[PDB]
Design an enzyme around this catalytic site. Structure first.
Site, short mmCIF file in Angstrom:
data_model
loop_
_atom_site.label_atom_id
_atom_site.label_comp_id
_atom_site.label_asym_id
_atom_site.label_seq_id
_atom_site.Cartn_x
_atom_site.Cartn_y
_atom_site.Cartn_z
N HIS A 142 0.84 -1.19 0.00
CA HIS A 142 0.00 0.00 0.00
C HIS A 142 0.88 1.25 0.00
O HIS A 142 0.69 2.17 -0.80
CB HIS A 142 -0.95 0.00 1.22
CG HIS A 142 -1.76 1.27 1.38
ND1 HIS A 142 -3.15 1.28 1.17
CD2 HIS A 142 -1.38 2.52 1.78
CE1 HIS A 142 -3.56 2.53 1.42
NE2 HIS A 142 -2.53 3.29 1.78
N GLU A 143 1.86 1.26 0.91
CA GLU A 143 2.78 2.37 1.01
C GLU A 143 3.57 2.59 -0.28
O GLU A 143 3.66 3.70 -0.81
CB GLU A 143 3.73 2.20 2.20
CG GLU A 143 3.02 2.29 3.57
CD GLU A 143 2.00 3.42 3.66
OE1 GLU A 143 2.19 4.54 3.23
OE2 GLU A 143 0.90 3.07 4.28
N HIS A 146 1.68 4.15 -3.12
CA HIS A 146 1.53 5.59 -3.02
C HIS A 146 2.61 6.28 -3.85
O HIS A 146 2.39 7.30 -4.50
CB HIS A 146 1.63 6.07 -1.55
CG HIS A 146 0.32 6.06 -0.82
ND1 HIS A 146 -0.84 6.61 -1.38
CD2 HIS A 146 0.00 5.59 0.42
CE1 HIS A 146 -1.81 6.45 -0.49
NE2 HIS A 146 -1.34 5.85 0.60
N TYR A 157 -3.94 14.36 -2.97
CA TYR A 157 -4.39 13.70 -1.76
C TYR A 157 -5.55 14.38 -1.07
O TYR A 157 -5.48 14.72 0.11
CB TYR A 157 -3.23 13.43 -0.78
CG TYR A 157 -3.43 12.19 0.07
CD1 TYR A 157 -3.35 12.26 1.46
CD2 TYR A 157 -3.62 10.93 -0.52
CE1 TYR A 157 -3.48 11.12 2.26
CE2 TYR A 157 -3.75 9.78 0.26
CZ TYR A 157 -3.68 9.88 1.65
OH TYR A 157 -3.81 8.75 2.44
N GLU A 166 -6.12 6.45 -2.58
CA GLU A 166 -6.20 5.45 -1.51
C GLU A 166 -6.61 4.08 -2.02
O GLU A 166 -5.99 3.07 -1.71
CB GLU A 166 -7.16 5.91 -0.38
CG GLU A 166 -6.44 6.63 0.76
CD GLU A 166 -5.33 5.83 1.33
OE1 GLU A 166 -5.48 4.73 1.82
OE2 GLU A 166 -4.18 6.43 1.24
N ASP A 226 -10.18 13.57 7.47
CA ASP A 226 -9.41 12.66 6.65
C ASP A 226 -9.18 13.20 5.26
O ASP A 226 -9.39 12.51 4.28
CB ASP A 226 -10.11 11.28 6.58
CG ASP A 226 -9.26 10.21 5.97
OD1 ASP A 226 -8.04 10.24 5.99
OD2 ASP A 226 -9.96 9.25 5.42
N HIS A 231 -9.57 8.04 3.22
CA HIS A 231 -9.54 6.68 3.73
C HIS A 231 -10.96 6.12 3.93
O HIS A 231 -11.15 4.96 4.30
CB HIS A 231 -8.69 6.53 5.01
CG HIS A 231 -7.23 6.75 4.78
ND1 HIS A 231 -6.62 7.97 5.04
CD2 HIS A 231 -6.26 5.88 4.34
CE1 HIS A 231 -5.32 7.83 4.76
NE2 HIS A 231 -5.08 6.59 4.34
C1 LIG Z 1 -2.39 0.22 7.74
C2 LIG Z 1 -2.70 1.23 6.64
C3 LIG Z 1 -2.55 0.57 5.27
C4 LIG Z 1 -1.76 2.41 6.77
C5 LIG Z 1 -2.22 3.63 5.98
C6 LIG Z 1 -1.15 4.74 5.99
SI1 LIG Z 1 -1.34 6.10 4.75
O1 LIG Z 1 -0.02 6.10 3.78
O2 LIG Z 1 -2.69 5.83 3.86
C7 LIG Z 1 -1.57 7.76 5.52
N1 LIG Z 1 -0.54 8.12 6.47
C8 LIG Z 1 -0.56 9.28 7.11
O3 LIG Z 1 -1.44 10.12 6.94
C9 LIG Z 1 0.60 9.54 8.08
C10 LIG Z 1 0.85 11.02 8.37
C11 LIG Z 1 1.26 11.83 7.15
C12 LIG Z 1 2.58 11.97 6.81
C13 LIG Z 1 2.95 12.72 5.68
C14 LIG Z 1 2.00 13.30 4.91
C15 LIG Z 1 0.69 13.18 5.24
C16 LIG Z 1 0.31 12.43 6.37
C17 LIG Z 1 -3.66 4.00 6.34
O4 LIG Z 1 -4.63 3.50 5.75
N2 LIG Z 1 -3.79 4.86 7.34
C18 LIG Z 1 -5.09 5.30 7.80
C19 LIG Z 1 -5.65 4.39 8.92
C20 LIG Z 1 -4.86 4.45 10.22
C21 LIG Z 1 -5.71 3.93 11.36
C22 LIG Z 1 -3.61 3.61 10.10
C23 LIG Z 1 -5.08 6.75 8.23
O5 LIG Z 1 -3.96 7.32 8.33
O6 LIG Z 1 -6.18 7.31 8.41
ZN LIG Z 2 -2.66 5.26 2.02
#
Ligand SMILES: CC(C)C[C@H](C[Si](O)(O)CNC(=O)CCc1ccccc1)C(=O)N[C@@H](CC(C)C)C(=O)O
Ligand SMILES: [Zn+2]
Ligand SMILES: [Ca+2]
Ligand SMILES: [Ca+2]
Ligand SMILES: [Ca+2]
Ligand SMILES: [Ca+2]
Length: 316
Positions: A142-143, A146, A157, A166, A226, A231
């Site tokens: 997933h990461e 991105h 985003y 997403e 969000d 998400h």
């Molecule tokens: C486990 C799940 C696949 C992890 C996801 C991480 Si994300 O890459 O979609 C979003 N991450 C961030 O927003 C981190 C902070 C940030 C840094 C730099 C720029 C912007 C933001 C995921 O689905 N995450 C979601 C669910 C959480 C409970 C893990 C979420 O972040 O809402």
């Molecule tokens: Zn993501």
């Protein structure tokens, strides 16, 4: 670093043993020279400064608890790279074999992960809600996806485009999971979520509503949280994707499944050829059918199934 390519062995987050590609130069580093320009894994040492220091080990054995997350981040990145290469003929996220970097042990009790525009970052979790995030292959993929998105469509985003962004990550994360044949499912992050509670997951592609996510365009979130529900609304596209592959009847509309492989081809094509930074759901629909068309012809079942799927989630 410059050194001799070798192979180490360690234990992952889930206690599974695996071999990892390392580099020898005084120490054994988590540096895989076998894939494109390399895969590099770093230790953030509970801090938030990135990327931290390239992972160094004295004996090429990674069985310490502190090692687990590094093992997995390093290993899963490789698998993901392979997927893109073998399946889509893509060299790294940029298509030009860019070095892949990941940092683990980010912060303290950090319940998330992210692509910071230059690399991947993984928290260790609080041990209650999550365990080290790199332990989930769908998560890693997933990461990494991105990044792929960033170098291609560049979907912004936020709002609809962000939701698409997403969904892409969830879809491909799932496909990679199937590719590795690691207890594959249509669920997201089940392996590192609620240590804790069995049978659960962060998100569901087969039934997004199970976790309160919309499974129909009429149920789309329109607030500001969000980033405008990136998400959240992803569940709509996720559901569509699920239907295209597996088929089914949703809200009275019947969809004939065409399978995972075709799903991937269709979506990858859309991603790389038709999508733009400001594309919306409706635009996504057009891109998807155009791709299927390109791939299988306008009168194909594939095109048909793509249409029904979008119809089913109320996306016209
Ligand atoms: C486990 C799940 C696949 C992890 C996801 C991480 Si994300 O890459 O979609 C979003 N991450 C961030 O927003 C981190 C902070 C940030 C840094 C730099 C720029 C912007 C933001 C995921 O689905 N995450 C979601 C669910 C959480 C409970 C893990 C979420 O972040 O809402
Ligand atoms: Zn993501
Ligand atoms: Ca060691
Ligand atoms: Ca699984
Ligand atoms: Ca999964
Ligand atoms: Ca759980």
């Amino acid at each position: 670093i410059t050194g001799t390519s070798t192979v180490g062995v360690g234990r992952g987050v889930l206690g599974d043993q695996k071999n990892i590609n390392t580099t020898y130069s005084t120490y054994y580093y988590l540096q895989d020279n076998t894939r494109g320009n390399g895969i590099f894994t770093y230790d953030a040492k509970y801090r938030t400064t990135l990327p931290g220091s390239l992972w160094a080990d004295a004996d090429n054995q990674f069985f310490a608890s502190y090692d687990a997350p590094a093992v997995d981040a390093h290993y899963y990145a490789g698998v993901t790279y392979d997927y893109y290469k073998n399946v889509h003929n893509r060299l790294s996220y940029d298509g030009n074999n860019a070095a892949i970097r990941s940092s683990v042990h980010y912060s303290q009790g950090y319940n998330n992960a992210f692509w910071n525009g230059s690399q991947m970052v993984y928290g260790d979790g609080d041990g209650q809600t999550f365990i080290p995030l790199s332990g989930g292959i769908d998560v890693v993929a997933h990461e990494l996806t991105h990044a792929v998105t960033d170098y291609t469509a560049g979907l912004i985003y936020q709002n609809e485009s962000g939701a698409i962004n997403e969904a892409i990550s969830d879809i491909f994360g799932t496909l990679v999971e199937f590719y590795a044949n690691k207890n594959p499912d249509w669920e997201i992050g089940e392996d590192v979520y609620t240590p804790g509670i069995s049978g659960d997951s962060l998100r569901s592609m087969s039934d997004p509503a199970k976790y309160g996510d919309p499974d129909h365009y009429s149920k789309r979130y329109t607030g500001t949280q969000d980033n405008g529900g990136v998400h959240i609304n992803s569940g709509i596209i996720n559901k569509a994707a699920y239907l295209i592959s597996q088929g089914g009847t949703h809200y009275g509309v019947s969809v004939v499944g065409i399978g995972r492989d075709k799903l991937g081809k269709i979506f990858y094509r859309a991603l790389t050829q038709y999508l733009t930074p400001t594309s919306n759901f409706s635009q996504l629909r057009a891109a998807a059918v155009q791709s299927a068309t390109d791939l299988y012809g306008s009168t194909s079942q594939e095109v048909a199934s793509v249409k029904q799927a979008f119809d089913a989630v109320g996306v016209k």
